[PDB]
Every structure is written in structure tokens, then in C-alpha cells.
Write an enzyme that holds these catalytic residues in place. Sequence first.
Site, PDB file in Angstrom:
ATOM      1  N   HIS A 197       1.850   9.060   1.332  1.00  0.00           N
ATOM      2  CA  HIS A 197       0.863   8.881   0.277  1.00  0.00           C
ATOM      3  C   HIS A 197       1.249   9.843  -0.842  1.00  0.00           C
ATOM      4  O   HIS A 197       1.699  10.959  -0.568  1.00  0.00           O
ATOM      5  CB  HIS A 197      -0.547   9.221   0.782  1.00  0.00           C
ATOM      6  CG  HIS A 197      -0.944   8.480   2.027  1.00  0.00           C
ATOM      7  ND1 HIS A 197      -1.720   7.350   2.004  1.00  0.00           N
ATOM      8  CD2 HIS A 197      -0.623   8.672   3.332  1.00  0.00           C
ATOM      9  CE1 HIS A 197      -1.881   6.896   3.240  1.00  0.00           C
ATOM     10  NE2 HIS A 197      -1.206   7.668   4.064  1.00  0.00           N
ATOM     11  N   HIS A 214       5.223   6.832   6.946  1.00  0.00           N
ATOM     12  CA  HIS A 214       4.984   6.447   5.559  1.00  0.00           C
ATOM     13  C   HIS A 214       4.466   7.681   4.825  1.00  0.00           C
ATOM     14  O   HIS A 214       4.214   8.723   5.436  1.00  0.00           O
ATOM     15  CB  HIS A 214       3.981   5.301   5.474  1.00  0.00           C
ATOM     16  CG  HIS A 214       2.651   5.694   6.023  1.00  0.00           C
ATOM     17  ND1 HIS A 214       2.341   5.582   7.358  1.00  0.00           N
ATOM     18  CD2 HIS A 214       1.589   6.311   5.442  1.00  0.00           C
ATOM     19  CE1 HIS A 214       1.133   6.084   7.570  1.00  0.00           C
ATOM     20  NE2 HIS A 214       0.660   6.550   6.427  1.00  0.00           N
ATOM     21  N   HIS A 252       3.117  10.904   6.906  1.00  0.00           N
ATOM     22  CA  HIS A 252       2.433  10.587   8.151  1.00  0.00           C
ATOM     23  C   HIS A 252       3.405   9.940   9.126  1.00  0.00           C
ATOM     24  O   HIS A 252       3.907   8.845   8.862  1.00  0.00           O
ATOM     25  CB  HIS A 252       1.279   9.622   7.875  1.00  0.00           C
ATOM     26  CG  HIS A 252       0.155  10.272   7.153  1.00  0.00           C
ATOM     27  ND1 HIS A 252      -0.823   9.567   6.485  1.00  0.00           N
ATOM     28  CD2 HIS A 252      -0.126  11.586   6.994  1.00  0.00           C
ATOM     29  CE1 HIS A 252      -1.665  10.435   5.945  1.00  0.00           C
ATOM     30  NE2 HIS A 252      -1.270  11.663   6.246  1.00  0.00           N
ATOM     31  N   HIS A 296       0.827  -1.212   0.000  1.00  0.00           N
ATOM     32  CA  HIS A 296       0.000   0.000   0.000  1.00  0.00           C
ATOM     33  C   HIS A 296       0.856   1.255   0.000  1.00  0.00           C
ATOM     34  O   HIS A 296       0.499   2.239  -0.637  1.00  0.00           O
ATOM     35  CB  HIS A 296      -0.967   0.027   1.217  1.00  0.00           C
ATOM     36  CG  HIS A 296      -1.706  -1.250   1.428  1.00  0.00           C
ATOM     37  ND1 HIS A 296      -2.696  -1.685   0.574  1.00  0.00           N
ATOM     38  CD2 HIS A 296      -1.635  -2.165   2.422  1.00  0.00           C
ATOM     39  CE1 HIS A 296      -3.190  -2.829   1.021  1.00  0.00           C
ATOM     40  NE2 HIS A 296      -2.557  -3.145   2.138  1.00  0.00           N
ATOM     41  N   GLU A 334      -3.556  13.512   1.093  1.00  0.00           N
ATOM     42  CA  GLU A 334      -4.825  13.045   1.633  1.00  0.00           C
ATOM     43  C   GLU A 334      -5.624  14.233   2.178  1.00  0.00           C
ATOM     44  O   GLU A 334      -6.734  14.541   1.708  1.00  0.00           O
ATOM     45  CB  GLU A 334      -4.556  11.979   2.694  1.00  0.00           C
ATOM     46  CG  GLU A 334      -3.863  10.762   2.095  1.00  0.00           C
ATOM     47  CD  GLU A 334      -4.182   9.491   2.833  1.00  0.00           C
ATOM     48  OE1 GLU A 334      -3.890   9.411   4.041  1.00  0.00           O
ATOM     49  OE2 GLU A 334      -4.756   8.579   2.196  1.00  0.00           O
ATOM     50  N   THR A 382      -6.519   6.574   7.731  1.00  0.00           N
ATOM     51  CA  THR A 382      -6.974   6.838   6.374  1.00  0.00           C
ATOM     52  C   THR A 382      -6.953   5.604   5.485  1.00  0.00           C
ATOM     53  O   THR A 382      -7.299   5.706   4.304  1.00  0.00           O
ATOM     54  CB  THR A 382      -6.166   7.944   5.703  1.00  0.00           C
ATOM     55  OG1 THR A 382      -4.851   7.457   5.485  1.00  0.00           O
ATOM     56  CG2 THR A 382      -6.151   9.223   6.509  1.00  0.00           C
ATOM     57  N   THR A 383      -6.542   4.462   6.013  1.00  0.00           N
ATOM     58  CA  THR A 383      -6.648   3.189   5.324  1.00  0.00           C
ATOM     59  C   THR A 383      -7.439   2.241   6.202  1.00  0.00           C
ATOM     60  O   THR A 383      -7.481   2.401   7.429  1.00  0.00           O
ATOM     61  CB  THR A 383      -5.284   2.540   5.054  1.00  0.00           C
ATOM     62  OG1 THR A 383      -4.663   2.192   6.290  1.00  0.00           O
ATOM     63  CG2 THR A 383      -4.373   3.449   4.288  1.00  0.00           C
TER      64      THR A 383
END
Length: 257
Positions: free
Chosen positions: A93, A91, A116, A61, A103, A195-196
Site C-alpha cells: 500500500h 503486496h 504485507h 487495488h 496503513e 485491511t481491504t
Amino acid sequence: HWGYGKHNGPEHWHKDFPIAKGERQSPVDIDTHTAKYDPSLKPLSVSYDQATSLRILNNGHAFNVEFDDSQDKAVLKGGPLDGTYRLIQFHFHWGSLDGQGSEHTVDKKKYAAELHLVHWNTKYGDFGKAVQQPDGLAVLGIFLKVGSAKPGLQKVVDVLDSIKTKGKSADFTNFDPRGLLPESLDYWTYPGSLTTPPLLECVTWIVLKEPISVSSEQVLKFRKLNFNGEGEPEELMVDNWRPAQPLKNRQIKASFK
Ligand SMILES: CCCCOc1ccc(S(N)(=O)=O)cc1
Ligand code: NA
Ligand code: NA
Ligand SMILES: [Zn+2]
């Protein structure tokens, strides 16, 4: 089997994770005009000098840089928090194009990526117990814009070739996450969620006002990662972001005027 594709992406998550339609989901758009300055908010205390990074993992992911969280080595305090929160991982995004990837958005503006830094409240003993609590986590979010390179990001960029596919990991000791911060620690904060999947509503979000600038080449190398495992059809790891979710009357506070 959740992901970011048309068949398993954010529109589908609610079927296996019904909290996707919950009351405090993340990310959100930060309307700067209507976020109110809160003079009771404290400065954020980021204490990362004793951080012990361990490993970098492609989890299918994103990629996660993991830390030793068995002592108070790298902690977040202050700000809106009333506890001490230990860094467990960070991590990112990011997008397929420089014009998307974050995000959170700011006045509906998307950044090229979002970092994040994930921390858990030490009063709950371990991350697993913390994610059973509405104040279990604090995530420090930092926007990335494309411009000049971020020197403190380069060690991350240069290991990515060794974790191309899902399930690959590599040593990643002696990384200093202080090199990923902007100059200012001014922030917005609101209560939200992961958020996942599993989308758990544990998170005090702390989103820094000041983006960091990374080079086009740095973010380009994020986009060469793969969602798939080795030996499977290649699917570039891009657009691994959830869009903004309904605010549902939460309020966003600003630490600054
Ligand atoms: C048991 C929870 C495992 C997933 O942990 C996480 C941790 C942080 C995030 S984020 N993107 O909201 O920072 C997402 C999932
Ligand atoms: Na407001
Ligand atoms: Na230990
Ligand atoms: Zn995240």
C-alpha cells in the site's frame, strides 16, 4: 465495486461489508508508549529460502506477487504464532506523496508505503478455509521510508511497466522475498483483520519495528500503475491505504524492550 476513491473508498465499505465496524479491524495506530513488552513472545522464524514465486498481478487495488503455497516452501513460525503459516502472496500500500501511504502508523507517523506478506495457517488446509477462522492468517507488515534504494525491491519495480492496468499479470519466478526484509525482526503484534474488503477478522498482525528504506524512484514507479483496466480512463494507483481504525481496547504487544 469497492475501491479507494471518494465514491467507493473506506467510508463506504461498511455498506457492503458491515464488519468494517467490527471489534478487531485493521490497520491501527501503534502507540509505542502503551504497547507493552511481552517476554513470553518468541523470536519470529522466517523461513523463505525455498520460496517459489510465480506471478505478479495488478488486481485493480494493488499489485500482488504470488507464491506456490501447495507445500511448506516459505513459512512463518514462532513469534506470537502457535502454528505454521505458509506465504501465499505479498503486496504493498502506498501514497500519492512520500508523507503518506502506510496503513499502520507508529505514534501517528505515516510511512511512504507498507509491505504485507500474507500467510495462512496450514492446519486449515487452504487459504479459503483459513479466512473462515479467527486465527487463519498471519500478515507480516514492513514499513517503507524513502531514502536509499532497496536492492531486493528493484526486480519488482522493473516489471511494473508490464502490469500497468487492472487484470494484467506477468511471470515473476525466482524472486527471493528475503531481500525485502530489514535487519531486525523485532516486532509488534495484535489481533486484527484484512485491511481491504471483505475485511475479515482472521489476522494475527506482526508489524516489524525497523522500516526498510526504498528510493524516491522506486516508490515513484509504484505510483505510475493504474487502478483502471486497459482502454478505460486512466486513474493512477495511489493512496490505496485504509486509515487507522479504532483499537477497541485491543492490546498491542512488543517483542522487544
Ligand atoms: C478472501 C480474501 C481475499 C483478500 O485477501 C486479502 C489478503 C490480505 C489483505 S491485507 N491488506 O490485510 O494484507 C487484504 C486482502
Ligand atoms: Na497496551
Ligand atoms: Na505442489
Ligand atoms: Zn495489505
